[PDB]
Design a protein around this ligand. Structure first.
Ligand SMILES: Nc1nc2c(ncn2[C@@H]2O[C@H](COP(=O)(O)OP(=O)(O)OP(=O)(O)O)[C@@H](O)[C@H]2O)c(=O)[nH]1
Ligand SMILES: [Mg+2]
Lengths: 147, 186
């Protein structure tokens, strides 16, 4: 993985580890435009210009998970990793996300870096005229019996 | 009661929403839904208001404005000063309908014009931005006098602000007039 973000429907980024590898100038804005207007529905389609991007929605807590890899071919473990990280987020950070108000989300701090790194290590280790013939005889059969 | 934040895309609405509450810088993305939060003023009275931020995308601006203008007590329109000269028309067109939909209310709320991104030297002055807004809106009304906010029967103010402030967010936050205006209208 070379890019990964977890931001809410309110336009606030909760956690990311992009680093010097990638800069989130406008990689997710185009995806947002495609979701809002195009309504892609193409199973994680729409690579923007240089790297493939995939997304996952969470209507229960109004959240979206975005993962960006290079345009080079990548294995299918990315979707499994996304599902696992989403389930871990829902299991652990349920207290903040269940609250509708954004004040609790602002106040809370999430130290998800180590757990996500462990999940990434596990994923990388896994990656490494009907003619009717007949005869000249007749049939023979008997009958049943009853009371 | 309620204060509604409006503006175009990448206008800093989320940053203004978060800085006035937490004061710590947070990475932000495009707003596609609404966000409402309760904020208590720093004065002795400690009045509690609700700040509501709506998406800046054109595809969802009206659908939420026409629904959230029923309980709005004040409105803050954020205008990007750094990139104003290349998008004069769009912000003026948005404000043209904003003014009509606000005047359609029973009670006229207060209006703030926050010229954001004032840290950059490219940012224009608030007075010049107001003059340009009047000049553009006079032509917008045509397409007997030039438009004047004094003639407009609203409590409109023009101020300068910046959320990130470029190099100004390392030690503090350059937001001083907004809180004073909120206290004055509180
Ligand atoms: N230096 C500086 N940059 C700002 C300021 N306000 C907004 N920005 C720019 O805005 C970018 C982030 O987008 P936001 O400010 O959150 O705009 P937004 O909330 O997405 O606005 P919407 O698209 O309507 O949701 C940053 O990369 C900044 O470059 C400011 O006051 N100072
Ligand atoms: Mg926003």
């Amino acid at each position: 993985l070379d890019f990964f973000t977890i931001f809410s429907k309110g336009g606030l980024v909760l956690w990311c580890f992009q680093g010097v590898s990638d800069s989130c100038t406008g990689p997710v804005n185009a995806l947002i435009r495609s979701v809002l207007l195009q309504e892609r529905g193409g199973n994680n389609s729409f690579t923007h210009e240089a790297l493939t991007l995939k997304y996952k929605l969470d209507n229960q807590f109004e959240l979206v998970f975005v993962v960006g890899f290079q345009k080079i071919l990548t294995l299918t473990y990315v979707d499994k990793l996304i599902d696992d990280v989403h389930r871990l987020f829902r299991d652990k950070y349920r207290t903040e996300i269940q609250q509708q108000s954004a004040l609790s989300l602002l106040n809370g701090t999430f130290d998800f870096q180590n757990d996500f790194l462990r999940l990434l290590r596990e994923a990388e280790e896994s990656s490494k005229e009907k003619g009717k013939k007949a005869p000249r005889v007749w049939e023979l059969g008997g009958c049943a019996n009853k009371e | 009661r309620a204060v509604l934040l409006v503006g175009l895309c990448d206008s800093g609405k989320t940053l203004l929403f978060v800085r006035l509450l937490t004061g710590l810088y947070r990475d932000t993305q495009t707003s596609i839904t609404d966000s409402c939060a309760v904020y208590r003023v720093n004065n002795n009275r400690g009045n509690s208001l609700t700040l509501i931020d709506l998406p800046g995308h054109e595809s969802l601006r009206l659908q939420f404005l026409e629904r959230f203008k029923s309980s709005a007590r004040a409105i803050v329109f954020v205008v990007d000063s750094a990139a104003f000269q290349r998008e004069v028309k769009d912000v003026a067109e948005f404000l043209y309908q904003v003014l009509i939909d606000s005047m359609g209310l029973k009670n006229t709320p207060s209006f703030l014009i926050a010229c954001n991104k004032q840290d950059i030297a490219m940012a224009k002055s608030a007075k010049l931005i107001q003059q340009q807004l009047e000049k553009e809106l006079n032509t917008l009304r045509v397409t007997g006098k030039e438009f004047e906010f004094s003639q407009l029967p609203l409590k409109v103010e023009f101020l300068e602000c910046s959320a990130k402030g470029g190099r100004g967010d390392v030690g503090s936050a350059d937001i001083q007039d907004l809180e004073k205006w909120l206290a004055k209208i509180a």
